[PDB]
Amino acid sequence: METLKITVYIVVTFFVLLFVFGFLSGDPARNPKRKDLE
Amino acid sequence: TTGERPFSDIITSVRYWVIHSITIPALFIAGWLFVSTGLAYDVFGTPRPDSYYAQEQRSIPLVTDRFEAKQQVETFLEQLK
Amino acid sequence: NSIFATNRDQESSGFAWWAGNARLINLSGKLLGAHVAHAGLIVFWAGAMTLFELAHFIPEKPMYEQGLILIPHIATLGWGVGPGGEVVDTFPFFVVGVVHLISSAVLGFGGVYHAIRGPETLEEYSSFFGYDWKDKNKMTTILGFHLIVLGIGALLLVAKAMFFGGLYDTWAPGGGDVRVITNPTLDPRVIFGYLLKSPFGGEGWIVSVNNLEDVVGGHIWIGLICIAGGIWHILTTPFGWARRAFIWSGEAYLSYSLGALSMMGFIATCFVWFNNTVYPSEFYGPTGPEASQAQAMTFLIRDQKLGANVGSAQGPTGLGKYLMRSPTGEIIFGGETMRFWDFRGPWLEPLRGPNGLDLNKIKNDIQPWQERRAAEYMTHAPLGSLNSVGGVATEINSVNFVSPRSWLATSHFVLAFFFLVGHLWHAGRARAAAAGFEKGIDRESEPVLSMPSLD
Amino acid sequence: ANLWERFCNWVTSTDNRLYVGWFGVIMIPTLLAATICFVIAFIAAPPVDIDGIREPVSGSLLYGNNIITGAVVPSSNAIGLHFYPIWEAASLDEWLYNGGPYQLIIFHFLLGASCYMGRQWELSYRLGMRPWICVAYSAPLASAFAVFLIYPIGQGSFSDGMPLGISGTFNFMIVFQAEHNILMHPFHQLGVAGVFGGALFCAMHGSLVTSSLIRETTETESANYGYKFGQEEETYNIVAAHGYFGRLIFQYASFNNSRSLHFFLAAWPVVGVWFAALGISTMAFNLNGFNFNHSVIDAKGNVINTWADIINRANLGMEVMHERNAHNFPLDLA
Amino acid sequence: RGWFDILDDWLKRDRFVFVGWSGILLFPCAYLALGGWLTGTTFVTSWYTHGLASSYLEGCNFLTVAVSTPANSMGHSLLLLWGPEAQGDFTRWCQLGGLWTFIALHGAFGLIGFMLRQFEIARLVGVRPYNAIAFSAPIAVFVSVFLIYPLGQSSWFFAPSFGVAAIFRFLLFFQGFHNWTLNPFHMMGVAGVLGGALLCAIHGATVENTLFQDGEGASTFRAFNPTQAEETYSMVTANRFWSQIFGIAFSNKRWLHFFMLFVPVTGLWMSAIGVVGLALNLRSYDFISQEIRAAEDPEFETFYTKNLLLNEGIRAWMAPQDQPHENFVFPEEVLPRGNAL
Amino acid sequence: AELTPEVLTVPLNSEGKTITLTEKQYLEGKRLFQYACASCHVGGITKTNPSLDLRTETLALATPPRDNIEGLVDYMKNPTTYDGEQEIAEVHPSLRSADIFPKMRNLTEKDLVAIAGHILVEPKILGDKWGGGKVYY
Ligand code: CLA
Ligand code: CLA
Ligand code: CLA
Ligand code: CLA
Ligand code: CLA
Ligand SMILES: CCCCCCCCCCCCCCCC(=O)OC[C@H](COP(=O)(O)OC[C@@H](O)CO)OC(=O)CCCCCCCCCCCCCCC
Ligand SMILES: CC1=C(/C=C/C(C)=C/C=C/C(C)=C/C=C/C=C(C)/C=C/C=C(C)/C=C/C2=C(C)CCCC2(C)C)C(C)(C)CCC1
Ligand SMILES: CC1=C(/C=C/C(C)=C/C=C/C(C)=C/C=C/C=C(C)/C=C/C=C(C)/C=C/C2=C(C)CCCC2(C)C)C(C)(C)CCC1
Ligand SMILES: CC1=C(/C=C/C(C)=C/C=C/C(C)=C/C=C/C=C(C)/C=C/C=C(C)/C=C/C2=C(C)CCCC2(C)C)C(C)(C)CCC1
Ligand code: OEX
Ligand SMILES: [Ca+2]
Ligand SMILES: [Cl-]
Ligand SMILES: [Cl-]
Ligand SMILES: [Fe+2]
């Protein structure tokens, strides 16, 4: 169970970091019109 | 447009409100008096607060006979002393 | 001469009447007006409602029996009450109400002024009070002023608790009373420990705060954090990473605040439903868990008086009728209230030992005041109809009661929810508007038409 | 371009058959976990002690259920609102007895569905659309949050969350009526107007547009071939449609502005269902439906029953029977 | 030339309220049904039929007022004012529940009138009569629930009474006595209603969020013209969005709108069929395999058996007051109850 | 039916003496009962001990008898267990315990008589419903 817990924690952390860094990676610019929004 | 005068023209006119400052309060008051004189009870056969039961009974005057229903209700109404 | 002569129409603004307030986005003077006048409305309500409550208040009768939500807030701050939350003086309630109501005239005055008489835009009048939503430095500066203002407000709670009479403490030794807090918790491991705990059962995140020392110390931290952050924002401008992360516009900022207020609303809902420390049950009525626990206490007491050995009484299912174990072994009340074993309250804690409810204390030490309180709470459970018929849904008319906890939880859930909807609406719109397609697709330049087919 | 840049480009790509996106990076694993656990549990899970009284309820197909009676059964009342992941159990056998699958499924589902909503915003932004489809979806989403999370919170237990099954749903509904008189609550009433109205307006709109399709086909072919995907011109005569509906009621009850019409189609069911969700979410804190029990009294003081009192008798029947072994004390307080 | 054609001309004139031949049936029947309901809920009792107060006059509110069904002893009497029960006495007629048959029958003919109006107007304007066709669903529902159902039961007494709370009672009765939630015909009905509301919402939202920019206003409603030839929103963009979000999408607007007709209409029709079965107590009450297992095995429990215990509660607790003509007396000791409650 | 003087005539004591309550007295008693008692005694039952109700026959068999005005007034000043054996002011609302039960604090002799009057009159109106619980709702 300890191994399962750690495995899930790492998995969840991995995807959450994808979400956060993903939306930090110039998201307003990812549209088909006005890109320079900073 | 359908040929009649627009509602917005009618309900913003002096003629309309002259007519309806009489008729609206009159209908409203007639309704009030239909109830306040107790006529509403008599027309519809609705029990007044003192007409659901005779003094001691706790049994509902339920109609149990299709064709003598008229008489049964009449009997129930007599039993209200 | 014309009805379209002003800028206050769809023809000039691009917004219909039902979106009328959107005409104010770049009219900083009238917008200031709207905001100050609105703040007036909030203050007016705090004032008028308190006086309404007081006029209707029978001081010896419990507050929670009287549809009060504001007097309980004032009482929790230590004003007007003594031991057990008894009302000793209604005048502090009168003062709070009057002063809010008088202050609302001033805000209302200034709001009306700025909205219809004062300068429509502030930029040509003053570069200090004027602003451009897109001016990132000016935005963080005003944010900064307000952060300092909020920091101060938090320190005012601290001041009240520490120097100006204290706060109502339901946990006060020997019974609930107003207590001066002399040793606020400053240890960041305790304070930020709350922020890191699970929101789930038996943990409850910040809603679990259970002593005034933690509450007061938390506000010392919040006060200083907010003041430091206020200074930070007046002295800095947003870093590159932040510039590229956000949308920079009035509507975007509105949307961020909407998401924040939604979150806070949901938090407040849970706070008033579960917490009996900053929402004392003396003032707000028992929590749902509390009243459920209180029922079990009540029948444990009655049946034990009759000769029942409550520790050994086996219920129909095999579990103890009065007492059982939690999943980690603590002795807890039985029946459906098994779910509520995380409940903690001053009437119950004296019966608690290291392993949970203590059979010897239950047999020997239950005081008449505990019996009274459990009975009171069991019969004031936060259940009732919309028309304020107290009790279960099948209860007959007789008792005029809905718990303040229910009024406050339901209202704030509804508000938190619509505020999330508002956040989505304005966040989506702000994105669309910044990118330039909030009004629809350019027929001559339809983006999907330049994309390859999916299949 | 570095590896992270390429990854971000693929994630947010408008050319993927199914859009991924950042909300999708959370949505995909959470929905797959919920779905897989749901399917395995619905087929093969052993009985679950939902009410914490050591009286296990069988939900799965292999343990004697059909499609209609089967469910993933809520976690134990002994658990309450405690977080019960697999790793908090001594064994899978314990986790199963206590209704662990239910927690795993509902939490992954709620997170996944919340991200489904974000994903709808996200793709709209990538495609240069207006942003509010996600706002419409917030209505059913809010309703799911109400029955799986908010109700459990208010009542103190996930054992009171809606079961993941057809008969389990009906159970939830009947108990809810007994305990909240939901029928007599104006927010549920708004919900009904929302869904009856939604279905009415769905049928109405569908019938009116169908009624006014421009002739483009012969009798030996489907009228649907008269419209070609992506054509510029409208496929029906809205003037004819309006001319019919305006005469059916009266001219001004009929929409002539298609934008106004389609906004109304969005708003009516969405607003009604937001209220439905708020009904459940506020009844979660026991502010219940109207109670007119014994509201009508005669001159002597005799109770004169109304239909509300008859409803109350039905509610009592539900109340006294539900969870027949769980209550030891006279009042059902959660 | 000729009175019929002259009458036809006048009936079909384009006025604010279209009349038509259909109006001769529709207007009086709809008016009397609505007026019957307002009159009964305002002034009329249910004391002699049900032992119930049912009007504002007696102290009921909007939620509790009703026009109640006649007593069970009336059977399926038409209960005409001049019939052998009321014998032309208006007051007695009201007290016997005559307004219930009044509203049901005038309401039925009014519905016929409305659907004829849908046909009449469609023919005159020159559109296909799909709106009338769609209206067959409300008609199937009304007829099955307010006519067929009580006609299979003992009397009109068991039809729905016309009232908010009264209708709620009808729902709960169907749960406790018919196990109506278990019925797959009701389930299809639920699917059509919820699916219809879903389609309504999703289509409305989709159009409103794939609009072309056809004006400079931030409020986008003005930028539409009733006579414009062009689609106001992008079908192509809508299709891509849903294909990528959900996996499938409409590509054909005509199919889309026909499907919007099909779903809620079919759903209502299915629920009507189930109610026709319930007229005869032909319920989906039980699963036999479940009952055989449960009877032999006192540890076997499902949500299905849990719901039947609730139903048994409903029947025993509601029956004596809900069915006063039966004169049920259930001693306290025979009432099914779990522990404590 | 109506609320007659006959209905409002209840035993004043155990010796056969009665008082006729005024309509006003009854309504005040009902109001005060709701105010101070119904949280536990709604409809004639007792929520914190359902074994003891407020039915006339039950009050008649209490010690001392409680099926009359004077017995009920005495109960409201100095409540006892059903056998008369223990004084229960400390856990039951009374004038004697108006300090810990504040809703009792300003009740006069006329107030208690009114409450007592309501308790004896209710069953004469409601029958089995009074003290009957949910079965009779
Ligand atoms: C909190 C609520 C609130 C507030 C503070 C405002 C504020 C404002 N709105 Mg918005 N609005 C609101 C809600 C609100 N609105 C709602 C609910 C709708 C939909 C009906 C609208 C629709 C709308 C539209 C379409 C427009 C506005 C506009 C405006 C601004 C100019 C109004 C004007 O020119 O007055 C002219 C009216 C008067 C002079 C009549 C008197 C009004 C005063 C303020 C009443 C004061 C009463 C008070 C009791 C006085 C006591 C004072 C005492 C303290 C001494 C103003 C800042 C306009 C705008 O944006 O300007 C550029 C605009 O076009 N509003
Ligand atoms: C946080 C908000 C809040 C809360 C929790 C309460 C709670 C309470 N109030 Mg107070 N009050 C408030 C704000 C609030 N009020 C406001 C804004 C006013 C000005 C009208 C008042 C004025 C007031 C008076 C005069 C009284 C109370 C009283 C009461 C009590 C009885 C409530 C009742 O019976 O409601 C009945 C329930 C309703 C009327 C239902 C409201 C439903 C609304 C209309 C729907 C809201 C949905 C949402 C916001 C709409 C969004 C639409 C969407 C499409 C965008 C209760 C303690 C009474 C009391 O006991 O005083 C001692 C009393 O006499 N309140
Ligand atoms: C958000 C609040 C707010 C803000 C930012 C402004 C901003 C402005 N006001 Mg407006 N006003 C307000 C609210 C506000 N007002 C209120 C509540 C009233 C009613 C009293 C007014 C009545 C008013 C009038 C009649 C006029 C203005 C004017 C001005 C302008 C110049 C003011 C100045 O010279 O400052 C310098 C002022 C000081 C240095 C003194 C400040 C001392 C304050 C009062 C005490 C500080 C304590 C604390 C922060 C108060 C917190 C209160 C809180 C609890 C609510 C500027 C655009 C003028 C204008 O627009 O010119 C055409 C003008 O004629 N205001
Ligand atoms: C109303 C309050 C408020 C607002 C609106 C802002 C707004 C801003 N701040 Mg300031 N800040 C504040 C208060 C506020 N601040 C206070 C009180 C302090 C003192 C501590 C600071 C100290 C501060 C610093 C040092 C910085 C900012 C920065 C910024 C900017 C970007 C922030 C950001 O990206 O957040 C979004 C957050 C992230 C992108 C990080 C991820 C956060 C995780 C994923 C969320 C976890 C929270 C969870 C959901 C719930 C909480 C519980 C949790 C503990 C478990 C933005 C202008 C930055 C800036 O540009 O300054 C010039 C910056 O460097 N702020
Ligand atoms: C089209 C309009 C319309 C329709 C369809 C109905 C329909 C109905 N009414 Mg309503 N009614 C209406 C308008 C209408 N009403 C209006 C305007 C009023 C206010 C005056 C009323 C007031 C009213 C009351 C008070 C009642 C009804 C009732 C009824 C029901 C029974 C009627 C009956 O038995 O008639 C029988 C008569 C006919 C069907 C007419 C037949 C005429 C034939 C065709 C003549 C035959 C001529 C022949 C061809 C000649 C051959 C010659 C040869 C011998 C050589 C039925 C549902 C009753 C009901 O609802 O009870 C519950 C009831 O009590 N109605
Ligand atoms: C201001 C009203 C408060 C919002 C309430 C929620 C209703 C509107 C949102 C529904 C979401 C549907 C999904 C998206 C559908 C969608 O995409 O809509 C799009 C539609 C048109 O978009 P536009 O871009 O033209 O306008 C919105 C902004 O850009 C401002 O111009 O938005 C509106 O019409 C907003 C109208 C608000 C004005 C009032 C709305 C009426 C509701 C009032 C509440 C009364 C009911 C209470 C009684 C029970
Ligand atoms: C802009 C605008 C608006 C708004 C407005 C506002 C929101 C405002 C306000 C306002 C306000 C917010 C106000 C106010 C006020 C107040 C006052 C005026 C006061 C006062 C007071 C007093 C007089 C007092 C007294 C007393 C005392 C001292 C004691 C006890 C008793 C008494 C109570 C008697 C609107 C929507 C229309 C629209 C258009 C624009
Ligand atoms: C007073 C008090 C206290 C305390 C408190 C505290 C100390 C606090 C806090 C707090 C805090 C410290 C907080 C917070 C927060 C945060 C947040 C809420 C966040 C956020 C974020 C966001 C929203 C983001 C977003 C995003 C992303 C994710 C990525 C990209 C993009 C964006 C940017 C959009 C206590 C409990 C002891 C007790 C009682 C009282
Ligand atoms: C039965 C009958 C008849 C008849 C009758 C009629 C035709 C009547 C009528 C009637 C009517 C025609 C009535 C009425 C009425 C009404 C009312 C009573 C009303 C009301 C209302 C209201 C109260 C309102 C409200 C509301 C709503 C709805 C919603 C929104 C808001 C509000 C809140 C505004 C005849 C002689 C043939 C014969 C025998 C029997
Ligand atoms: O777990 Mn499911 O159902 Ca809510 O109330 Mn208490 O807990 Mn049980 O009883 Mn009734
Ligand atoms: Ca203009
Ligand atoms: Cl229990
Ligand atoms: Cl159950
Ligand atoms: Fe459409």
Largest CA distance in chain F: 42
Contact C168, C280 (CB under 8 A): yes
Rounded CA separation B24/C224 (Å): 66
Q: What angle do CA E260, E261, E267 make, to 5 degrees?
A: 95
Which residue(s) pair with C400 in the sheet?
C389
Contact C392, C237 (CB under 8 A): no
The resolution of the experimental structure, rounded to one decimal in Å, is: 5.0
CATH of domain B1-80: 1.20.5.860
- Supply C331's token pair: 């002795």
**Chain F hits for C62, Cβ within 8 Å:** 102
Rounded to the nearest angstrom, the distance between the alpha carbon of C24 and the centre of ligand 11 is: 14
Most ligand 2 atoms within 8 A of CB, residue of D271, D287, D290 to mutate? D271
Please give the backbone phi and psi of residue F9, each rounded to the nearest 5 degrees, phi first. -90, 115
Q: Does E76 reach chain B within 8 Å, measured CB to CB?
A: no
Q: Distance, in angstroms, between C246 CA and closest chain A CA?
A: 7
Residue nearest to atom 16 of ligand 2 (CA): C45
Q: Which residues lie below 8 Å from residue C366, measured CB to CB, with a gap of 6+? A: C301, C351
**Chain D hits for C340, Cβ within 8 Å:** 80, 156, 334
Distances (CA, A) of C212 to C166, C219, C358: 10, 11, 27
Task: Tell me if B54 and F4 make a contact (CB, 8 A cut-off).
Answer: no
Rounded CA separation E82/C452 (Å): 76
Please give the backbone phi and psi of residue C332, each rounded to the nearest 5 degrees, phi first. -135, 165
- Residues with beta carbon inside 6 Å of ligand 2? C 52-53, 56, 67-69, 388, 404, 407-408, 411, 414, 418; D 271
Write down the residue that tokens 């007061």 correspond to: C216
Please give the backbone phi and psi of residue E192, each rounded to the nearest 5 degrees, phi first. -65, -35
Length of chain C: 455
Q: Which chain B residue shows the shortest CA-CA distance from F4? A: B55
Helices A2-24 and D21-44, packing angle to 10 deg: 150
Q: Does F129 reach chain D within 8 Å, measured CB to CB?
A: yes
Encode C211-237: b = buried (16+ Cβ within 10 Å), e = exposed.
Answer: ebbbbbbbbbbbbeebbebbeebbeee
Instruction: Using alpha carbons, select from C374, E259, E302 the residue that is nearest to residue D67.
Output: E302
- Supply E271's token pair: 């629920």
Which residue(s) pair with C168 in the sheet?
C178
Residue F90 lies in a domain: yes
Q: For the residues of D136-153, what is the DSSP string, one character each?
A: HHHHHHHHHHIIIIIHHH
Residue C394 burial by CB count (10 A; 0-12/13-18/19+): exposed, middle or buried? buried
Q: Half-sphere exposure of E227 toward its Cβ, with a 13 Å CA cutoff?
A: 0
Length of chain E: 341
- Residues with beta carbon inside 6 Å of ligand 10? C 336; D 51, 77, 155, 159-160, 175, 179, 322-323, 326, 332, 334
Q: For the residues of D198-258, what is the DSSP string, one character each?
A: HHHHHHHHHHHHHHTBPP-S-TTS-GGGGS-TT-SB-SB-HHHHHHHHHHHS-GGGS---H
Expressed in angstroms, the distance from the first to the final Cα of chain B is 64
Residue E98 burial by CB count (10 A; 0-12/13-18/19+): exposed, middle or buried? buried
Q: What angle do CA C401, C406, C411 make, to 5 degrees?
A: 120
Q: Which residues lie below 8 Å from residue E111, measured CB to CB, with a gap of 6+? A: E138, E139, E142
Rounded CA separation C215/C77 (Å): 12
Q: Which residues lie below 8 Å from residue E286, measured CB to CB, with a gap of 6+? A: E179, E308
Instruction: Using alpha carbons, select from E145, E175, E176, E148 the residue that is nearest to residue E162.
Output: E145
- Report the relative pairing of strands D287-288 and C384-385 from DSSP bridges: parallel
Best mutation target among D149, D180, D329, D332 (most C Cβ atoms within 10 Å) is: D329
Summarize the annotated binding site of D for Fe cation as residue ranges: 205, 262
In Å, how far from its chain's centre is CA E261?
A: 17
Q: Domain boundaries in chain C?
A: 1-285+382-455, 286-381
Task: Tell me if F106 and C60 make a contact (CB, 8 A cut-off).
Answer: yes
Q: Distance, in angstroms, between B7 CA and closest chain D CA?
A: 11
In single-letter form, the type of residue at position A33 comes to K
**C-alpha Rg value of chain E to the nearest Å:** 26
User: Can you list the positions of beta strands (E) in C16-90?
Assistant: none
Q: What angle do CA D91, D94, D95 make, to 5 degrees?
A: 85
Q: For the residues of D287-302, what is the DSSP string, one character each?
A: EES---TT--B-SSS-
Write down the residue that tokens 């309401």 correspond to: E107
Rounded CA separation C448/D10 (Å): 17
Rounded CA separation C427/C416 (Å): 16
Contact D253, D246 (CB under 8 A): yes
Give every strand in the sheet of C352-353, ordered side by side.
C323-325, C331-333, C356-357, C352-353
Summarize the annotated binding site of C for [CaMn4O5] cluster as residue ranges: 349
What is the sign, positive or negative, of the torsion defined by CA atoms of C68, C73, C78, C83? positive
Contact A33, C436 (CB under 8 A): yes
- Supply F21's token pair: 């309550």
In Å, how far from its chain's centre is CA D99?
A: 22
Write down the residue that tokens 């019960």 correspond to: D84
Rounded CA separation C429/D135 (Å): 11
Encode D243-263: b = buried (16+ Cβ within 10 Å), e = exposed.
Answer: bbbbbbeebeebbbbbbebbb
C residues 336..375 contacting A (CB < 8 A): none
Q: Distance, in angstroms, between C151 CA and closest chain D CA?
A: 32
Does E83 contact ligand 5 (Cβ within 6 A)? no
Instruction: Using alpha carbons, select from D36, D44, D85, D40 the residue that is nearest to residue D61.
Output: D44
- Supply E314's token pair: 């409903």
Q: Half-sphere exposure of E284 toward its Cβ, with a 13 Å CA cutoff?
A: 17
| Chains in touch with A (≥3 Cβ pairs < 8 A) | C, D
Rounded CA separation C133/E291 (Å): 69
Residue nearest to atom 55 of ligand 1 (CA): C109
Distances (CA, A) of F44 to C349, D316, E121, E286, F54: 33, 18, 63, 40, 5
Contact E323, D314 (CB under 8 A): no
Q: Which chain D residue shows the shortest CA-CA distance from E125? A: D244
Q: Where are the alpha helices (DSSP H) in C344-403?
A: 359-364, 368-378
Best mutation target among C207, C336, C380 (most D Cβ atoms within 10 Å) is: C336
According to CATH, the superfamily of the domain at C286-381 is: photosystem ii from thermosynechococcus elongatus (1.10.10.670)
CATH of the domain at D106: 1.20.85.10
Q: Domain boundaries in chain B?
A: 1-80
- Residues with beta carbon inside 6 Å of ligand 7? C 34, 37-38, 40-41, 44, 51, 98, 101-102, 104-105, 108, 111-112, 115
The 10 Å Cβ neighbour count of residue E269 is 19
Length of chain F: 137
Distances (CA, A) of F63 to F40, F58, F75, F113: 21, 10, 10, 19
Domain total for chain F? 1
**Chain E hits for C451, Cβ within 8 Å:** 240
- Residues with beta carbon inside 6 Å of ligand 3? C 32, 36, 106-107, 109-110, 113-114, 118-119, 122, 126, 129
Instruction: Using alpha carbons, select from C263, C271, C362 the residue that is nearest to residue C311.
Output: C362
Contact C161, C216 (CB under 8 A): yes
Contact C302, F49 (CB under 8 A): yes
In single-letter form, the type of residue at position B16 comes to Y
Rounded CA separation D180/D289 (Å): 6
Most ligand 7 atoms within 8 A of CB, residue of C6, C53, C101 to mutate? C101
Contact D270, D132 (CB under 8 A): no
3-state secondary structure of C130: coil
Q: Distance, in angstroms, between A38 CA and closest chain D CA?
A: 17
Contact C109, C131 (CB under 8 A): no
Instruction: Using alpha carbons, select from C340, C356, C347 the residue that is nearest to residue C298.
Output: C347
**Chain D hits for C259, Cβ within 8 Å:** none
**Chain E hits for D132, Cβ within 8 Å:** 205, 208-209
Question: Which structural domain range is residue F125 located in?
Answer: 2-130
Experimental approach: X-ray
Residue F137 lies in a domain: no
Q: Which of D4, D12, D23 sits opposite A30 (nearest CB)?
A: D12
Q: Which atom of ligand 10 is nearest to the CA of D50?
A: 1
Task: Tell me if B50 and F1 make a contact (CB, 8 A cut-off).
Answer: yes
Rounded CA separation D142/D187 (Å): 14
Is the bond leading into C199 cis (omega within 30 degrees of zero)?
A: no
**Chain F hits for D306, Cβ within 8 Å:** none
**Chain E hits for C439, Cβ within 8 Å:** 213, 215-218, 220, 223
- Supply F41's token pair: 């005694």
3-state secondary structure of A7: helix
Distances (CA, A) of D172 to D146, D169, E301: 12, 5, 16
